[PDB]
Amino acid sequence: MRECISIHVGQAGVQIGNACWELYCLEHGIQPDGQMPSDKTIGGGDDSFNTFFSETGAGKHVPRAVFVDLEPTVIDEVRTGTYRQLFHPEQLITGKEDAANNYARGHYTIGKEIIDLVLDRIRKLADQCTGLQGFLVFHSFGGGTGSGFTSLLMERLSVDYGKKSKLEFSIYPAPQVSTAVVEPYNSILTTHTTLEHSDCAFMVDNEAIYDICRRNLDIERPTYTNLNRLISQIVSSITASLRFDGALNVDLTEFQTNLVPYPRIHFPLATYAPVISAEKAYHEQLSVAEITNACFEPANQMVKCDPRHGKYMACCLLYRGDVVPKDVNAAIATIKTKRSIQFVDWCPTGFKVGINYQPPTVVPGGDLAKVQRAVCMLSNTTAIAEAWARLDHKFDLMYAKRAFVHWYVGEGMEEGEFSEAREDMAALEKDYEEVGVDS
Amino acid sequence: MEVIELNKCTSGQSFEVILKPPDPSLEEIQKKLEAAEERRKYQEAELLKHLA
Amino acid sequence: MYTFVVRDENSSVYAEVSRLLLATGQWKRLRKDNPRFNLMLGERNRLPFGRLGHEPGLVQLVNYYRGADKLCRKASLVKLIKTSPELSESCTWFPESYVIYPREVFLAAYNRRREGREGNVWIAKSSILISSEASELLDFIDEVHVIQKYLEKPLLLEPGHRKFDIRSWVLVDHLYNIYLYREGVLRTSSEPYNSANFQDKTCHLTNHCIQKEYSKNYGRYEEGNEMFFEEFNQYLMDALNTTLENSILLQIKHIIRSCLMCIEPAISTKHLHYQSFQLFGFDFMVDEELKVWLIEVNGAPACAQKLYAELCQGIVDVAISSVFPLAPTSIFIKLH
Amino acid sequence: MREIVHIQAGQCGNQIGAKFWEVISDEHGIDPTGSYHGDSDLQLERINVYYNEATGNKYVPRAILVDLEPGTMDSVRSGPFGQIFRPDNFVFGQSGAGNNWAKGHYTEGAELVDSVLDVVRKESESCDCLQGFQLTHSLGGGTGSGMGTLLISKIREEYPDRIMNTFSVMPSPKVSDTVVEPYNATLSVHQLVENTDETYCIDNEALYDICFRTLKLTTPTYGDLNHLVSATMSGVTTCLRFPGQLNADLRKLAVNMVPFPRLHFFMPGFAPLTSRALTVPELTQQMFDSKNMMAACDPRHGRYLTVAAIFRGRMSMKEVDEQMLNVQNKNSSYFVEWIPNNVKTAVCDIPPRGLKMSATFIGNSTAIQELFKRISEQFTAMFRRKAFLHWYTGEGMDEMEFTEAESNMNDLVSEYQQYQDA
Ligand SMILES: Nc1nc2c(ncn2[C@@H]2O[C@H](COP(=O)(O)OP(=O)(O)OP(=O)(O)O)[C@@H](O)[C@H]2O)c(=O)[nH]1
Ligand SMILES: Nc1ncnc2c1ncn2[C@@H]1O[C@H](COP(=O)(O)OP(=O)(O)CP(=O)(O)O)[C@@H](O)[C@H]1O
Ligand SMILES: Nc1nc2c(ncn2[C@@H]2O[C@H](COP(=O)(O)OP(=O)(O)O)[C@@H](O)[C@H]2O)c(=O)[nH]1
Ligand SMILES: [Ca+2]
Ligand SMILES: [Ca+2]
Ligand SMILES: [Ca+2]
Ligand SMILES: [Cl-]
Ligand SMILES: [Mg+2]
Ligand SMILES: [Mg+2]
């Protein structure tokens, strides 16, 4: 058994961490007080769920998690919420004054003042690990803390834990729920600084989650709670292989091995189905073939884009519920005879499949309906570069006039960092073009 | 279209179906951070000089 | 009020479409880099499809199908026909064609014709040389191209003993309905066809530009080298005792349906975050047995001068006002 | 990012500040004795932004009252909420400033500014995490204009990393007390350009026009003008005073609103304009209407760099989003294309007093240059003949200072023009 440490940075990261750990407790039968009746080894053990929970002698199962925010109002909600008993104070780190949606303020001005405290609190969790495999880092692209402090933390984690894998869950900015005009600046800056330090990053475009909630959950104006419950379902689908028995994606290194043949092209596209409203009393249970077909419809993707006009480098199907391999293979055959699924020619045209028999868990009183089977497809497709193109275009539009640049220079950053990060993004888009498009 | 590496357990099973064959150092980081801090201090000193 | 942008200033069709949209009083043109549009009349090359459909509160529509280039490039079309099971190498309305880069398959079939005394004339073109000897074509290429069986027995209009090609305009809307404009056009040669001299490329190439320069009889039989469907149907009746519909138009509709339905799964915007339509120009040949052959598909076609008004009005009716409604006798035949 | 320190200087500053405190004390359920009597915890969740908590359950505004003559502050102390202010936070002299920026900035005000700063320091020292300061003042008089800008300079020297926010009333010949108001305002604008992060330009011309044309008030008083000012101030501080995601503190507001450091002068607006049921389309349409702007500028004469919209009341957030997207999409020419998604929208459930729904508008428009051009023309008309300068040279100022202030304000106008044309 090898431990994973989760790090939640900024508002988006912390609230998504709340949702994820609530869902984990429900999936593993851990009560809000940390007790887990089905765990018959008191005070220890090396079960799969111990990858994410440590155990006290009193029988409490404690998340291997650190929460970091530069202002205290969001983490105070963890301290006062349902699962407060789950966490010890040393896991919850707050400052007094946030990064004001400023990458430079998060990375330099304040980050330099809190980075050592954060690293010490992470070290304390690492010292409880017999074989730490790495970190899962949850953060927004757009916020000052989520971008700048995350980039700083990733650099320091590369220094202090060189041999350890680092995965990201990154919230891509969307104007319908965004709070800052400079979010494209922050996104490109943190992507440039983090690119060398992340082995695999799962981008979640708030636009996609928002529209999925509106369309499939019939929520007229989704809130962060709706978005985070959906995002936590997807995150749980991704980490279930680390948290349960199974042969596929069982350590962080396997994510990179299976999904990322080239280190820089490490942003898999996630697609999830089915998303069904709890309000909808009569509901037709979708078959394996139907939900597998839904994985290739952009309307179900975590990032809106068109894989038909890109190329695949890897594809994993993660089923939960009543699913058998024969039905999986039948569905794949049918879909292949009907869809534009083109792989790069130096890669096999194949699917790596895992099935967990436990159907997805949903939060009681939530918006998601309980379904008999669901699937999350993680495919590494060049089409995801459409999001980089969008972000870089907005960046270019603002930076041609140096709009808002003085806010970043004022925190000790140099203007050259903008153009350096943008050139790194241009090289990334060019890499995606080379791997994905024919002449 | 072949199925390979089928592993089964009590909680699920995995396999693979094929349809067709084919870092900066701590010192450098502290240096960056201190350079930014010094540029901040210089801008603030310039402001205080102007106000004086 | 609906909003649109114009990013191809060199398109006559969509210049007229922009004019019509403005003259309705319910469409307002923005600067070309304004993202808050309902409609994009986009550029021919590197249209930023990846940036469409990400504007909240805006239903966004573009006048091009991403991926339709597969149908509208010579080599791409050859490869698509040969490798698509829906079309297959056994396809009977596309001339034998091969993609050659600056081969062995081409020479193999060519040798079958050589030691078979058969008509062995081929044409080489790209995105032109007509020869009966393969070495000359292959040498011409090296100085990506397609080599294609040259139809040595074309249908010849009389009087004049002259060659022609047929241009059909086809509109595919956001629902992937296929509309064939009821008005086609025949681009005619004004010089008598000469099966003994492919050296002179004026009685062999029916292009309007080529005629209007190298043909000394340009404009003799019709204006300018354009015969429209009423006169061509009357000619077919008088001369060959058949109608245009029976002898040619059925095959034309079949071919259009075949190609567009073949590529539908790859370009359809049915469940996409933005929507597409596109106008296509299909170019057909007719041999002396009244068999129709597909020559090429144009992704950004022009129109016959006297048909611009009707066709562009039909565009704004079928493709644009269907998505953005304003406050029978359809000019299109719906193919299904 | 928690506590804000409030300062009100001069006659106009203290009158509009007293009305502001009355309004937001009602909104937060605080009675004139400092006791809370509301019915919703939303009223208390961020009460510490503007109020200290005192012995018992008393809430005392973090407010400092400054003037160079006692009259207006005696009237505040006798006003409805007069007893709510901390007695030690009244800092006044006796000489007055005689509508003279030089007296406010260099002589009379210089004699009082240190005790004002002492009170500022005492308030800041008991702040968990000071965000910065908001100042209410006029630019046409002497104390507000000159001594407020002096106070801003001193506070910037002592707190260089804190946000400076002002509510600045621009003089207008339509509602004028003296002919030297263009001098005082031009001298003040230079200081604000250098030493504030955000300035709400409240143009008395616009307030008069609204009271007369729209509210059908034949003879508008300063009370009637200050009704609009207090409603607008409550609107623009809603995101600071109530829980929310967008522009929830002064620095985030500045980062969202200020693309270039000098262009930080905001045009506020309010809907509905009052002295019985608005739909969201009506709220949006009116809030973008020039006749609802508190700066006498035609926005259709310039371009929006950034916009913040705040809707208050119980309404369909779906419909709010639809209507804001509608306004942007159908008038996109008036929003600069080189700042994508420059309109941000907040919704607060708690409406102001007397209304079921309202909307407050904060625009950083290049059309604000019309206000500064108007002030510059009125300045030059007197300055070219050196009229009324002796009031200022008698206080130690030299003409070169006026020439330089004129130059800088002309530069500000030229910068707005550059970005209007970009
Ligand atoms: N899906 C989702 N997105 C969120 C959530 N909270 C914030 N965001 C998004 O994240 C971006 C804002 O970044 P934040 O995480 O709020 O900022 P931060 O990390 O706290 O950094 P600072 O507040 O500037 O110190 C915007 O695009 C928001 O839409 C959340 O709970 N769920
Ligand atoms: N197998 C073939 N047999 C007989 N004629 C042929 C032929 N292939 C092409 N042609 C002739 O070539 C002429 C046009 O050539 P082509 O098909 O390349 O279009 P084009 O390149 O001139 C227009 P564009 O490329 O812009 O769409 C036609 O008039 C046609 O008669
Ligand atoms: N909206 C409003 N404007 C005022 C008020 N009092 C003065 N003004 C204006 O402010 C200018 C005079 O400033 P004033 O505050 O009286 O001088 P000070 O006391 O020395 O700062 C003139 O332009 C007045 O019109 C007021 O109560 N409300
Ligand atoms: Ca155990
Ligand atoms: Ca006065
Ligand atoms: Ca004295
Ligand atoms: Cl290590
Ligand atoms: Mg935050
Ligand atoms: Mg052609």
Residue numbers in the entry:
A (entry chain A): 1 to 439
B (entry chain E): 6 to 27, 44 to 73
C (entry chain F): 1 to 102, 128 to 152, 160 to 175, 179 to 362, 371 to 379
D (entry chain B): 1 to 42, 45 to 277, 284 to 360, 369 to 438
Paper text:
Here, the benefit of using a wavelength of 2.7 over 1.9 Å is demonstrated for native-SAD phasing on a 266 kDa multiprotein-ligand tubulin complex (T2R-TTL) and is applied in the structure determination of an 86 kDa helicase Sen1 protein at beamline BL-1A of the KEK Photon Factory, Japan. Both Sen1 and T2R-TTL can diffract to about 2.4 Å resolution, but only data up to 3 Å were collected and successfully used for phasing.
We used the tubulin complex T2R-TTL to assess the advantages of native SAD at 2.7 Å. We used the ratio of observed diffraction intensities between the two wavelengths to achieve a dose-normalized comparison. Native-SAD phasing was also possible at 1.9 Å but only by merging 21 datasets, which constituted more than double the dose used at 2.7 Å. This example clearly illustrates the benefits of performing native SAD at a wavelength of 2.7 Å over 1.9 Å for crystals with 100 µm diameter or less and with minimum extra surrounding materials in the absence of air absorption.
